[PDB]
Amino acid sequence: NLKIFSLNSNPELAKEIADIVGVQLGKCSVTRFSDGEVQINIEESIRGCDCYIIQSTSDPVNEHIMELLIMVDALKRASAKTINIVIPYYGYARQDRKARSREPITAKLFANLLETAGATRVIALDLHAPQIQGFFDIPIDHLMGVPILGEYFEGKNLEDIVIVSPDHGGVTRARKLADRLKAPIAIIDKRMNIVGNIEGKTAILIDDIIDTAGTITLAANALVENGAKEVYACCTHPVLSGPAVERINNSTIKELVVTNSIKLKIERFKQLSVGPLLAEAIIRVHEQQSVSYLF
Amino acid sequence: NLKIFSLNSNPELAKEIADIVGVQLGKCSVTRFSDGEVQINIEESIRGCDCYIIQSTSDPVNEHIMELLIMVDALKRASAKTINIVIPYYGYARQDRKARSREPITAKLFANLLETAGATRVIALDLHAPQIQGFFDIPIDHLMGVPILGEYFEGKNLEDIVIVSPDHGGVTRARKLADRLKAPIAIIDKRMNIVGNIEGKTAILIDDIIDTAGTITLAANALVENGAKEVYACCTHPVLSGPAVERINNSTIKELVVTNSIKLKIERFKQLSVGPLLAEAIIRVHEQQSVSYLF
Ligand SMILES: Nc1ncnc2c1ncn2[C@@H]1O[C@H](COP(=O)(O)CP(=O)(O)O)[C@@H](O)[C@H]1O
Ligand SMILES: Nc1ncnc2c1ncn2[C@@H]1O[C@H](COP(=O)(O)CP(=O)(O)O)[C@@H](O)[C@H]1O
Numbered sequence: 001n002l003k004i005f006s007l008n009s010n011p012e013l014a015k016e017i018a019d020i021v022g023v024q025l026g027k028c029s030v031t032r033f034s035d036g037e038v039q040i041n042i043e044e045s046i047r048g049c050d051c052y053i054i055q056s057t058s059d060p061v062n063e064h065i066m067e068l069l070i071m072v073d074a075l076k077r078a079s080a081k082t083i084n085i086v087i088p089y090y091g092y093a094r095q096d097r098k099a100r101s102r103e104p105i106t107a108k109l110f111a112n113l114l115e116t117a118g119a120t121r122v123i124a125l126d127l128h129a130p131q132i133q134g135f136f137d138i139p140i141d142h143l144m145g146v147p148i149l150g151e152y153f154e155g156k157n158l159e160d161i162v163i164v165s166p167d168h169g170g171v172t173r174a175r176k177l178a179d180r181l182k183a184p185i186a187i188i189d190k191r192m193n194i195v196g197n198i199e200g201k202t203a204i205l206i207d208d209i210i211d212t213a214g215t216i217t218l219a220a221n222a223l224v225e226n227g228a229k230e231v232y233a234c235c236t237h238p239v240l241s242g243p244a245v246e247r248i249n250n251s252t253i254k255e256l257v258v259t260n261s262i263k264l265k266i267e268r269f270k271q272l273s274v275g276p277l278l279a280e281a282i283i284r285v286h287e288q289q290s291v292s293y294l295f
Numbered sequence: 296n297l298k299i300f301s302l303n304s305n306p307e308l309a310k311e312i313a314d315i316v317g318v319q320l321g322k323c324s325v326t327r328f329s330d331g332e333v334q335i336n337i338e339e340s341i342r343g344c345d346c347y348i349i350q351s352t353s354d355p356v357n358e359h360i361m362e363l364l365i366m367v368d369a370l371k372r373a374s375a376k377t378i379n380i381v382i383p384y385y386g387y388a389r390q391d392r393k394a395r396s397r398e399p400i401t402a403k404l405f406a407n408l409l410e411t412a413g414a415t416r417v418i419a420l421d422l423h424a425p426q427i428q429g430f431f432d433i434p435i436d437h438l439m440g441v442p443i444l445g446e447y448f449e450g451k452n453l454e455d456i457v458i459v460s461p462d463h464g465g466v467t468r469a470r471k472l473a474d475r476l477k478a479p480i481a482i483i484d485k486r487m488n489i490v491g492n493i494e495g496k497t498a499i500l501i502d503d504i505i506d507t508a509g510t511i512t513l514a515a516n517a518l519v520e521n522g523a524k525e526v527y528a529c530c531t532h533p534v535l536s537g538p539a540v541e542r543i544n545n546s547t548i549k550e551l552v553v554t555n556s557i558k559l560k561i562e563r564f565k566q567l568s569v570g571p572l573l574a575e576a577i578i579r580v581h582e583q584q585s586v587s588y589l590f
């Protein structure tokens with residue numbers, strides 16, 4: 001049958017996914033010996049079971065990566081039938097090529113590591129570059145989070161919107177959101193110009209990851225300065241490190257909308273859940289049903 | 296110790312490169328048996344030599360891919376020291392992810408095939424997606440073509456330029472060319488809107504591949520209709536299949552600028568050579584000098 005294990009990155013999301021699915025989370029202690037080495041106890045036999053491990057490789061990234069790899073090894077040697085990795089947030093996704101000399105392509109190395117450890121398949125959400133799906137030779141399902149952010153805004157009954165991409169590489173994303181809301185797009189062209197008509201419109205800034213918030217807050221204020229009626233901001237993954245919160249709270253962003261792909265105070269925010277989406281992906285993968293239906 | 300072989304895709308480019316490097320192309324004939332199967336005769340012993348093969352996997356793509364793989368196999372079994380692949384145009388680079396269900400990720404399979412056949416390293420030019428560099432675990436150098444197209448436009452003394460991206464996924468590229476030309480950018484948003492000020496400006500349309508020319512010609516005419524003084528168009532790889540030439544010749548494109556990464560009658564065009572760029576790269580790879588010196 002189906003066993004779901006949660007590691008340490010996002011226990012809540014895991015529990016939420018297990019409940020939506022209708023099963024109790026797997027019994028296992030994933031602790032740390034006194035020396036910081038990862039210790040793993042899977043307290044119930046799992047021979048012949050299909051295991052799903054839920055882990056975001058978010059802060060601290062290297063610890064979550066290692067306890068994930070170590071867990072995969074434990075399951076492989078314990079005879080799991082399949083070892084399915086559910087990764088709500090894929091750390092290192094941004095290092096997807098040699099942008100400069102002698103740089104590692106970490107997203108690819110992670111992929112090689114996971115396969116070497118023994119992973120059977122991966123279920124990922126809003127990967128920074130969709131080409132990362134090709135970094136694996138094991139099956140990998142890539143879910144989009146935009147439909148979730150889109151539904152929330154549509155329910156706000158907004159009028160006169162313009163979807164804004166905070167930089168050059170986010171235009172495709174901005175376009176997927178514009179499509180769903182039947183709206184135009186404008187882009188921030190920082191060398192900080194604004195390409196597109198944002199005058200008197202409700203601007204929605206969308207990015208995949210919101211990390212330090214420099215570009216996003218900087219872009220918001222400039223949207224307002226240039227005539228936008230109000231600015232909303234959203235992303236799938238709330239990394240929010242450094243002075244992010246500080247910056248967001250002090251900006252002109254009316255509301256920051258994020259998902260719980262990463263565990264988290266912000267004054268004007270709203271966290272949407274990707275629990276239902278992942279749970280449903282899990283069931284379909286497990287009942288061998290079409291996943292394309294989720295798109 | 297250095298030997299360069301040309302396969303059938305682009306003999307001219309290969310000879311040009313060898314002339315710059317100063318070697319005579321290696322002795323081998325790649326022909327067809329009466330039934331269509333590749334026959335490969337390597338006329339000289341290459342034991343211990345560093346072999347570089349020059350092949351674009353352009354039309355007919357599957358034939359060029361097979362003769363390349365078969366050549367790699369011949370070299371491997373003939374004891375080449377290294378087998379270095381110079382790919383000016385990487386066919387199948389557009390299938391870099393699962394954009395819709397049950398699709399293959401061909402760019403990745405090609406990479407897996409090349410390594411399986413025995414490739415040591417790859418030198419590629421303007422890959423459709425830079426992440427394709429991470430599809431390999433063998434070393435791969437990714438040369439850029441924009442600087443070549445940029446130099447040629449600066450020599451036009453065009454004023455009031457705007458670089459235009461023909462769609463959402465080409466904005467980063469458009470930006471690298473704008474940076475060069477210290478110019479602004481506009482983008483075509485087809486659901487066919489134009490986001491950006493193109494009124495009375497010389498518009499330069501830039502894409503990586505120009506295949507059927509539907510989007511590009513369609514974008515040109517719309518640029519003109521909306522107030523652009525004149526439109527130029529450029530790309531690195533001239534696939535130009537189908538009714539491309541037909542369409543280009545009949546459009547308002549003042550001049551189509553391409554490179555010779557792919558072998559080619561167009562009325563207003565200009566072909567620039569990537570021969571010098573690839574040749575210097577081969578020399579630096581063989582000598583183990585810095586390749587990043589070239590960027
Ligand atoms: N419209 C979509 N947007 C983006 N990619 C999608 C969409 N539809 C399907 N895909 C891709 O196809 C994958 C799932 O499809 P498959 O498992 O091949 C087929 P099945 O429909 O049998 O599950 C997803 O993980 C995603 O990568
Ligand atoms: N400015 C840059 N733009 C794009 N790619 C670059 C840049 N700098 C270096 N690279 C990457 O680094 C590769 C070449 O440098 P490396 O082999 O890492 C180091 P070396 O300079 O020692 O050769 C290129 O093929 C390219 O992928």
Ligand SMILES: CP(=O)(O)OC[C@H]1O[C@@H](n2cnc3c(N)ncnc32)[C@H](O)[C@@H]1O
Nearest residue numbers: 092093094095099100103128167169211
């Ligand atoms: C705008 P992009 O092209 O999507 O961003 C990729 C760049 O960000 C850098 N990057 C990688 N990991 C990072 C991280 N965790 N924080 C900040 N930037 C990162 C990479 O070196 C790469 O040059």
Ligand SMILES: CP(=O)(O)OC[C@H]1O[C@@H](n2cnc3c(N)ncnc32)[C@H](O)[C@@H]1O
Nearest residue numbers: 387389390391392393394395423464506
């Ligand atoms: C510009 P893009 O968003 O990178 O385009 C990717 C899509 O173009 C298509 N594509 C793949 N191979 C191609 C080919 N040789 N001819 C035309 N389009 C191709 C596929 O439908 C793929 O999902």
